[PDB]
Amino acid sequence: AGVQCTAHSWGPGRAVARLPRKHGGIGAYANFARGGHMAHPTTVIRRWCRKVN
Amino acid sequence: RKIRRRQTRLQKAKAIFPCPLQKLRPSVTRCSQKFNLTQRIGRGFTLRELQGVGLSAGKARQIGIAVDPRRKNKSEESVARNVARLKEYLSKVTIFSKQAKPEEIQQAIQHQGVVMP
């Protein structure tokens, strides 16, 4: 989710904030960007069950 | 999965209503000094113990006794645990014959669980 798109960072000195960007220059691959991957993705690998003796 | 296997296991039971799903296997001394005293379910009664009971190798498999020609009798005491085991099964077994008699077969107690634990 979110990592599907392709973005190579535009990089400093081009006046763009430094964030991975698409061909036009749209925010991608960042929690603060629209459409980016939530930085810490939720997980199906959780301790769903809490055992009792 | 537990349910899947349970349902599948009971389907096996009705495909053969007379015979218990798991066959009788022999008690075998657990290996290594730590496990010498306890005995365990084993692959198969050896051909020697089976001939002590008096059954040919093929006949035993038909009756549900598994015969593994790999195991060697080894200890004489191993012959003792297994030959009596086979004995306690051959008495506790009722073999339906005469083609198929329907009413008698319908009242069959299938032994769910491993035989002669």
Partner: protein, 89 residues
């Protein structure tokens, strides 16, 4: 080590699996090895070993056999088997 220490190891009688009716090459296997040896002949590595024996005695003959066959037990047997041909000519 690889054995536990029970001074009185042995509380159950033991039957020894043995021999399994220990067999032999039997008449045919040896006869055939004669039939082929008669027509095809001896291999070159063997010829060198036999020729070593008429002049040199053992030592270097075993050394050629270890290199050619790769194990001393096979070699000791080969040097000995080959020697039977050596004491005639």
């Amino acid at each position: 080590p690889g054995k536990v220490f029970n001074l009185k190891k042995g509380g159950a009688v033991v039957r020894i699996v043995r021999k399994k009716e220990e067999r032999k090459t039997k008449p045919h296997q040896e006869f055939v090895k004669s039939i082929i040896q008669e027509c095809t002949g001896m291999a070159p590595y063997e010829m060198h070993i036999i020729e070593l024996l008429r002049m040199n005695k053992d030592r270097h003959a075993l050394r050629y056999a270890k290199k050619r066959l790769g194990n001393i037990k096979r070699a000791k047997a080969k040097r000995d088997q080959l020697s039977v041909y050596a004491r005639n000519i």
